[PDB]
Amino acid sequence: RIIVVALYDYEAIHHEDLSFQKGDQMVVLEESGEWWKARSLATRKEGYIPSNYVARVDSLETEEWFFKGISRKDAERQLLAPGNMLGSFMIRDSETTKGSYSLSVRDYDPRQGDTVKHYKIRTGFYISPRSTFSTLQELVDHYKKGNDGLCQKLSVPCMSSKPQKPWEKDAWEIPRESLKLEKKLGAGQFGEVWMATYNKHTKVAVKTMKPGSLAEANVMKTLQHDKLVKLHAVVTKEPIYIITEFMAKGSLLDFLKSDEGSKQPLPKLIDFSAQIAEGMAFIEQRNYIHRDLRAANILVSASLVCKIADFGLARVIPIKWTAPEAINFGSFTIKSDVWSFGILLMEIVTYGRIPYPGMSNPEVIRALERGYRMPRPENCPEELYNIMMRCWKNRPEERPTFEYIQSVLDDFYTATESQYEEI
Ligand SMILES: CN1CCN([C@H]2CC[C@H](n3cc(-c4ccc(Oc5ccccc5)cc4)c4c(N)ncnc43)CC2)CC1
Ligand SMILES: [Ca+2]
Ligand SMILES: [Cl-]
């Protein structure tokens, strides 16, 4: 007999799914993945629920200060998000010490400004050997009344964010009749992009493909990562419709040329690059290939999260983003994507400017033949430019991995020794 509790509110929009509010308890009857079958103790109704909206009772996820399955960088991004103040904290799974936990706290220092520092939690639990607590709760309560060795006294927990609702069960292939393409967002050579609605209940974005231009997509849907755009469903009858999640802030390029994007400081740009590098690192680990990396194929969520789009799509069917071995001999690999990432990095740091300004494609290729590379912008840090340069090496094998680039960009302003604070 398994009993869960609802972490968030939820309004049912399907046939047999269940409505519930936070605090409500339910009885688990079946575990089929994203969708679980349960019975509400409040309404006595039996129906499907999003598994990621509930958790076992009196478990750790049920705590307002515990965030499961979150990395250090993600913790820092969430803590520095709007609606948080000094002392804002969270406890999470250590991503480098499996089985143990870590505490992330929001601090401030006049040199850097608002920061986020992380302490290791050793197992009873303790951060400092002088103070030992029976439970994690005792630890937080302790560090709420004084910092006793910490850089900041604990205040309120980090602002939680309601997760994305799971797509309809077994609804990968859908009939076109279920869609209402409401607004054309953009038009291109190979198709269009619309702001649609699925079954009158879910807002989505659909990429319509011209008939001239399924297996590859069946591969794509397995590439599920926070920094890739989620791929929900597809229409299998020409013209093919690709139904994905709707990114409110549009493409990265247009955002960088927007005014709000023009207000974005340098560390924010670097952060964007870190997210993109993270996603590309995921694709790298999965041994996949993007084949068309650029700010135009990067989308931005309303919360300023960057997600890689159109990955792998170029295969099924921009010399300035293309590596020379890819232009000359058509050799497309992950390293050419590293080159493209260099160019993208230049796009981001120059707020959407077009690469090689005042240069045509063949002119650019001939420049590359001479060993020419783009100069460093005024507002671009030397080290970041070095990263770009390492991305722009003639031999692809000598180009860095997305794992390394991600590691560097994540801790760009943090010394390796200063990742975790010791007490
Ligand atoms: C002048 N600009 C105006 C803005 N136009 C851009 C193009 C349309 C927008 N656009 C495009 C997309 C979009 C949709 C589906 C898609 O399919 C795949 C996803 C992963 C892997 C393979 C395929 C890829 C991308 C998009 C979106 N989802 N949610 C929100 N906006 C979206 C973003 C703006 C480009 C021209
Ligand atoms: Ca420097
Ligand atoms: Cl019962």
Residue 418 lies in a domain: no
Which residues sit opposite 106 in a β-bridge? Answer: 116
Its sign, for the CA torsion 51, 52, 57, 60, is positive
CATH of the domain at 100: 3.30.505.10
> Any residues with CB less than 8 A from the CB of 267 and at least 6 apart, and which?
413
187 is in an annotated binding site: yes
Distance between CA atoms of residues 60 and 70, nearest Å? 14
Structure-block tokens of residue 198: 């699925």
17 in catalytic set: no
Whether 41 and 182 share a structural domain: no
Q: Token digits for 244?
A: 């994905």
| CA-closest candidate to residue 165, choices 119, 122, 125, 202 | 202
Please tell me the distance between residue 25's alpha carbon and the centre of ligand 3 in angstroms.
10
Q: Name the pairing type of β-strands 420-421 and 113-121.
A: parallel
Distance CA 56, CA 217 (A): 35
Task: For residue 15, give its domain range.
Answer: 1-62
Q: Are residues 355 and 233 in the same domain?
A: no
| Domain contains 39 | yes
Solved by what technique?
A: X-ray
Radius of gyration of the CA atoms of the chain, in A: 24
Q: Is residue 36 part of a domain?
A: yes
Largest Cα–Cα separation, the chain: 74
d(CA 203, CA 89): 33
Q: Which ligand is nearest to the CA of 376?
A: 2
How many CA atoms, within 13 angstroms, populate the side-chain half-sphere of residue 363?
6
Structure tokens at 93: 């799974």
Query: Is residue 166 assigned to a domain?
Result: no
Q: Count the neighbouring beta carbons within 10 Å of the beta carbon of residue 315.
A: 12
57 torsion bin: left (phi>0), alpha (psi -120 to 50), beta (else): beta
Q: How do strand 113-121 and strand 101-109 relate by DSSP bridges?
A: antiparallel
Residue that is last in its domain, among 160, 186, 208? 160
Q: Which ligand is nearest to the CA of 196?
A: 1
- Final residue in a domain of this structure, among 21, 43, 62: 62
**Beta bridge pairs of residue 114:** 108
User: 151 C-alpha vs ligand 3 centroid, how far in Å?
Assistant: 47
Distance CA 258, CA 292 (A): 23
Preceding omega of 239 cis (within 30 degrees of 0): yes
C-alpha of residue 373 to centroid of ligand 2, in Å: 20
Task: Examine the fold and report which residue of 113, 133, 160 is the final residue of a domain before the chain moves on.
Answer: 160
Q: Looking at 24, 107, 271, 292, which residue is catalytic? A: 292
Place of tokens 């291109």: 188
In angstroms, this model's resolution equals: 3.0
Pocket test for ligand 1, best of 182, 185, 249, 301 (most atoms within 8 A of CB): 185
Which DSSP state fits 52?
A: G
Instruction: Classify strands 66-67 and 89-93 as parallel, antiparallel or unpaired.
Output: parallel
Counting ligand 1 atoms within 8 A of each CB, the residue from 222, 234, 299, 300 with the most, and so the one to mutate, is 299
What's the CA gap between 171 and 154, in Å, rounded? 44
The Å distance, Cα 349 to ligand 2 centre, comes to: 14
Tokens of 116: 């986020």
Please list every protein residue whose CB sits less than 6 Å from any atom of ligand 1: 185-186, 193, 205, 207, 220, 229, 231, 242, 244, 246-247, 250-251, 254, 299, 309-311, 313
Identify the CA nearest to 190 among candidates 217, 214, 210. 210
Give me ligand 2 centre to Cα 380, in Å: 9
DSSP string, 108-166: EETTTEEEEEEEEEB--BBSSTT--BSSHHHHHHHHHS--TTSSS---SBPPP-PPPPP
In this structure, the answer to whether residues 293 and 393 fall within a common structural domain is: yes
Query: Which of 377, 297, 368, 366 has its CA nearest to residue 337?
Result: 297
Confirm whether 255 is domain-assigned: yes
With beta carbons less than 8 A apart as the criterion, state whether 410 and 402 touch: no
On whether residue 419 sits in a domain, the answer given is no
Q: How many CB atoms lie within 10 A of CB 323?
A: 25
Q: In what order do the strands lie in the sheet with 101-109?
A: 66-67, 89-93, 101-109, 113-121, 420-421
Give 312-349 as a DSSP string.
THHHH--GGGS-HHHHHH----HHHHHHHHHHHHHHHH
Do 74 and 227 meet the contact criterion of CB atoms below 8 Å apart?
Answer: no
Does some domain include residue 5? Answer: yes
Residue 179 CA, chain-centre distance (Å), reads 26
| 390 in the same domain as 257 | yes
Q: How many separate domains does the chain show?
A: 4
Nearest CA to ligand 1 atom 14: 207
DSSP string computed for 356-389: STT--HHHHHHHHHHT--PPPPTTS-HHHHHHHH
Whose CA is closest to atom 21 on ligand 1?
310
In DSSP terms, 17 is beta-bridged to 48
**362 and 255 in a common domain:** yes
Q: In this structure, what token pair is assigned to residue 103?
A: 């505490």
- Angle, in degrees to the nearest 10, between helices 266-285 and 402-410: 150
Task: Answer yes or no: do 257 and 405 share one domain.
Answer: yes
Q: What is the CATH number of the domain that holds 23?
A: 2.30.30.40
Q: Please report how many Cα atoms fall inside a 13 Å half-sphere around the Cα of residue 256, on the Cβ side.
A: 26
Q: Are residues 299 and 402 in the same domain?
A: yes
d(CA 284, CA 341): 13
C-alpha distances (whole Å) from 404 to each of 341, 361, 412 are 13, 30, 12
- For residues 16 and 47, the answer to whether their CB atoms sit within 8 Å is yes
Report residue 345 as tokens. 């990095």
CATH number at residue 298: 1.10.510.10
Name beta bridge partners: 27. Answer: 3, 39
Query: Is the same domain home to 316 and 273?
Result: yes
Q: Domain check: are 270 and 367 in the same one?
A: yes
Q: Is 207 within any annotated ligand binding site?
A: yes
Q: Which residues pair with 40 in a beta bridge?
A: 26
Could you identify the residue written with the tokens 């205040």?
155
- The answer to whether 80 touches 382, Cβ cutoff 8 Å, is no
Q: Are residues 6 and 52 in the same domain?
A: yes
One domain, residues 102 and 8: no
Q: Are residues 404 and 390 in the same domain?
A: yes
Q: Which ligand is nearest to the CA of 39?
A: 3
Q: Classify residue 109: in a domain, yes or no.
A: yes
Q: Specify burial of residue 192 (Cβ count, 10 A radius: 0-12, 13-18, 19+).
A: middle
Q: What is the rounded distance in angstroms from the CA atom of residue 25 to the CA atom of residue 366? A: 67
Centre a 10 Å sphere on the Cβ of residue 255 and count the other Cβ atoms it contains. 23
